[PDB]
Amino acid sequence: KADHIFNLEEQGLLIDIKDDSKGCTTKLESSGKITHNATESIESSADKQIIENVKDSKISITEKEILLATKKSSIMLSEDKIVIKIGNSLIILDDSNISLESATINIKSSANINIQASQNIDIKSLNNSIKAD
Amino acid sequence: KADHIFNLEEQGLLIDIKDDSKGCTTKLESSGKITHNATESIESSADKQIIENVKDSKISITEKEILLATKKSSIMLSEDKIVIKIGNSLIILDDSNISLESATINIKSSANINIQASQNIDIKSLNNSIKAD
Amino acid sequence: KADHIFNLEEQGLLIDIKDDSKGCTTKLESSGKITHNATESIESSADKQIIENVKDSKISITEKEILLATKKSSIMLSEDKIVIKIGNSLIILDDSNISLESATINIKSSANINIQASQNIDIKSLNNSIKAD
Amino acid sequence: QFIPLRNDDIILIEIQSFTKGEIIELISNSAISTKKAQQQLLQRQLLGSKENCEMAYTQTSDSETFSLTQVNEDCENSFLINDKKGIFLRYKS
Amino acid sequence: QFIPLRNDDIILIEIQSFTKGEIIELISNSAISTKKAQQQLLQRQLLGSKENCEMAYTQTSDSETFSLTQVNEDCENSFLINDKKGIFLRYKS
C-alpha cells in the first residue's frame, strides 16, 4: 500500500517514502536546510572517519578516538584513557588513575564526604591547613 | 570500472555508487530505516546548527556550544566552561576552577590519595571529622 | 533565481541545490566519501535509534540513553545517572552522589582546595596519613 | 521505428493482379482524445500488448504534464514533468 | 500516435467528386535544423501549443546530448544525457 514521491520544485528535493503508516522523508531545501526523518532509526556506518564541523567545533570518530571538541575545550574518548580539557583544568581518567588537576579546586556538599581508602592516604600541603568541629 | 544504481522498488531508494573495490550505499527504506555507508568517511559541515533529536534527547552543535542533553541531564561544552549536570550533582570545569558540587560525595580508592597543593589548603567542616591510622 | 543539478558521472552523485546565495550540496563519491553541506543546519530526527559505528566505536541514542563508547571506554548519559568508565576508574554522577572511584587517585592544584561541608566529614584511612605546614 | 501491425487494425488492401495483394492505408487508432479540444490537448502513444503505457503531453488549462506511465496490476510507475511542480518520479500500488 | 492537424499546417487537398474532398500530403514542418549538417545532427520533436518542449538528440562534434526539455516562463525543466558527463536532472528559473 506504499507511496513514493521524488520532487524538484523551486524549494528542492522533497523525497518521502511511505508505507501505510511508516515513512522516511528527506528534504534538501533551497533555504539552506536538510531534514532527515524516519520511524525507527538512522544507522550510518563508515570505515575510517565521521567528521561533523560547524565552524571549528568537531565531533569526530576514528577506530579508537572520539573527539568532542571546540576551541579551548576537548573530550578525548581515547582507548583506555579519557582526557577532559579546559585550559587549565584537567581530569584524566586512566586505567588506575583519576588525576583531577587545575590551579584551584572548590568542593562543596550538603551532607557528607565519605572518604575511604584501602591503604594509606598522603595529604601533602603547604603554609596553612584548617578544620572545624 | 565503476557501477552506479538508483532504484525505486516497493522498499525504497537503494542507491549504491561503487568503484572496483570502494563504494557508498544509501538506503531510504519503507520499513523506516536510513542506512548510510562509505569506505572512508562521512563529512558533514554546516553554518549554524546540527540537531539530532530522538524524543527529547539532543546532540546539538552551535558556533560555541555542544550540548549533550536529555531530560534531567546535560553536558555543555561551552567556550572556556564545561558544565556537567544531574539535578543535583554538578561538576563545573572553568578556566582555573574545578567545582565538584552535590549534596553528598563518596570517594573510594585502593592505593592512595596523593594530594599536593602549591599553596595552603583550607578544609572547612562542621560537627565531626575523623581519621584512622 | 534557483539552480538544481543531479548528476551521475564516474565519480557519483554530485547533487547541489542552490538559491542565489544559499545552497546544499551532497556527494556520494566513488572514492569512498559522503559530503553533506548546508548553510543553516542538518536536522535529523528518528523514533528509536541513531547508531554511528566506525569499527566498534559507537555514538548511540535511545529514548533515554546516550552512549559514547569504544572498547575499554564508555560514557552513559542515562536518565538521572551519568556513568563514566575506564577499567578500572569510575565516576558515577547520581542524583545526590558523586562517587569518584579507582585504584589510585592523584590530586594536584596550584592555589587552594577550598573544601566546605554543610555537615560532618568522615575521612577514613589506614596505615599512614601525613600533613605539612 | 519498428511498430508492427497488431491485431484489431483495419486496413485497405489492393489486389494488383491474380495472386498479388498489397497494403496501403490505415483506418483505425487506439489512442485518441474524447474531449472537446478546449479541456485537454492530448499528444500520446500507447505501447505493447495490453497497452499499459503512455507517452503523453496533456495540456489542460492549468498544467502541461509530460508523462511516461505504466499501469500494471499492483504496480504503477511513472515519470512526470509539470510546469508548476517539476520533475517527478513515482511508484504506486 | 495521436498528433492532430494544428493550425499553420499546409496541405494538399483532392476534390474527388462534387461535395467530396480529401487530405493526402503534408507540406510544412515546425522543428528542423538551420545548420550545415557538419555542426549539429538534429533529430527532435516539438510538442503541444506554444511548442515549449523538445525530445532532441543533438549530436555535435563534442557531445551527444539527449534532452527532454521545457521552456516556460520562469520555469525551465529538463532531462539530459551526455556521453562525457552523464544523466542529468535540472530545474532553472
Whole-number Å distance between alpha carbons of A93 and A79: 11
In angstroms, how far is the first alpha carbon of chain C from the final one?
Answer: 76
Per-residue DSSP letters for chain C? Answer: --EEE----SSEEEEEEE-SS--EEEEEESSSEEEE--SSEEEE--SSEEE--SSS--EEE-SS-EEEEETTEEEEEETTEEEEEETTEEEEE-SS-EEEEES-EEE--SSEEEE--SS--EE---S------
Contact assignment for E91 to C3 by CB distance below 8 Å: yes
User: Nearest CA to CA, how far is C42 from chain B (Å)?
Assistant: 5
B-chain residues near A106 (CB < 8 A): 97-101
CA distance C13 to chain E (A): 10
**Residue E64 host element (H or E):** strand E64-69
- Quote the cell numbers at residue B97: 576552577
Nearest to E4 by CA among E21, E26, E19: E26
Q: How far apart are CA A63 and CA C122, in angstroms?
A: 44
DSSP code of D48?
S
For residue B13, give the nearest of A17, A116, A117 by CB distance: A17
**Cα–Cα distance for residue pair A35/A16, rounded to 1 Å:** 11
Inter-chain touch A9–E91, beta carbons under 8 Å: yes
* Interface contacts D/E by beta carbons within 8 Å: 46
CA-CA distance, C61 to B35, in Å (whole number)?
A: 16
- Residue in the structure block whose three cell numbers are 581508602: A117
- Give just the sign of the alpha carbon dihedral E28, E32, E36, E38: negative
* Closest Cβ opposite residue C6 in set E88, E92, E93: E88
C-alpha cell at B27: 538506503
Q: Do A9 and D89 touch (CB under 8 A)?
A: no
CA D13 to chain CA mean position, Å? 25
Residues of E in Cβ contact (< 8 Å) with A10:
91, 93
CA distances from D12 to D9, D21, D26, E16 (A): 10, 11, 7, 18
- Name the nearest CA neighbour of C69 among A60, A79, B36, A74: A79
3-state secondary structure of D87: strand
Q: In the 8-state DSSP scheme, what is residue E73?
A: S
Nearest to A12 among C4, C36, C108 (CB): C4
Residues of D within 8 A of B10 (CB-CB) are: 91, 93
Question: CB A4 to CB D89 under 8 A?
Answer: yes
Resolution in A: 4.0
CB-CB contact of B54 with C65 (8 Å): no
| Whole-Å CA distances, B94 to A1, A72, A116, C14 | 57, 11, 28, 44
| E65 neighbors E82 (Cβ within 8 angstroms) | yes
Q: What are the CB-based long-range contacts (under 8 Å, 24+) for A70-79?
A: A70/B64, A70/B66, A70/B77, A70/B79, A71/B79, A72/B79, A72/B80, A73/B77, A73/B78, A73/B79, A73/B80, A73/B82, A75/B77, A77/C68, A77/C69, A77/C70, A77/C73, A77/C75, A78/C73, A79/C70, A79/C71, A79/C72, A79/C73
Q: Smallest Cβ distance to B89: which of C77, C93, C122?
A: C93
Quote the distance between the C-alpha of residue E87 and its chain's center. Answer: 21
- Chain C neighbors of E87, CB-CB under 8 A: 6-8
Cβ C73 vs Cβ C88: under 8 Å: no
Q: Are B50 and B61 in contact (CB under 8 A)?
A: yes
Helix (H, G, I), strand (E, B) or coil at E7: coil
User: Omega before A88 cis (within 30°)?
Assistant: yes
| 3-class DSSP assignment, residue E70 | coil
> Which residues on E lie below 8 Å from C3 (Cβ)?
90-92
DSSP readout, chain B? --EEE----SSEEEEEEE-SS--EEEEEESSS-EEE--SSEEEE--SSEEE--SSS--EEE-SS-EEEEETTEEEEEETTEEEEEETTEEEEE-SS-EEEEESEEEE--SS-EEE--SS-------S------
Cα distances (angstroms) measured from residue C97 to each of B103, C81, C83, C92, C119: 7, 10, 12, 8, 15
Q: Distance between CA atoms of A29 and A14, rounded to whole angstroms?
A: 8
Q: Give dist(CA C129, CA A117) in Å, integer.
A: 11
Which residues of chain B lie closer than 8 angstroms to C114, CB-CB? 122, 124
- Nearest in space to A104 (alpha carbons), one of E68, C115, C48: C115
User: B67 has which bridge partners?
Assistant: B60, B76
Furthest C-alpha separation in chain A: 80
Angstrom distance (rounded) from CA C18 to CA E56: 27
Between positions 69 and 88 of A, the ones with CB within 8 A of E are none
What does the block give as the cell for E73?
A: 516562463
Q: Are strands A104-107 and C112-115 parallel, antiparallel or unpaired?
A: parallel
Helix (H) or strand (E) holding E58: strand E54-59
Nearest CA in chain A to C110: A103
Q: What Cα–Cα distance (Å) separates residue C78 from each residue in B31, C49, C67?
A: 28, 14, 8
**Distance from C-alpha of B105 to C-alpha of E92, rounded to nearest angstrom:** 65
Nearest to B112 among C35, C42, C104 (CB): C104
Instruction: Give the 3-state secondary structure of chain A.
Output: CCEEECCCCCCEEEEEEECCCCCEEEEEECCCCEEECCCCEEEECCCCCEECCCCCCCEEECCCCEEEEECCEEEEEECCEEEEEECCEEEEECCCCEEEEECEEEECCCCEEEECCCCCCEECCCCCCCCCC
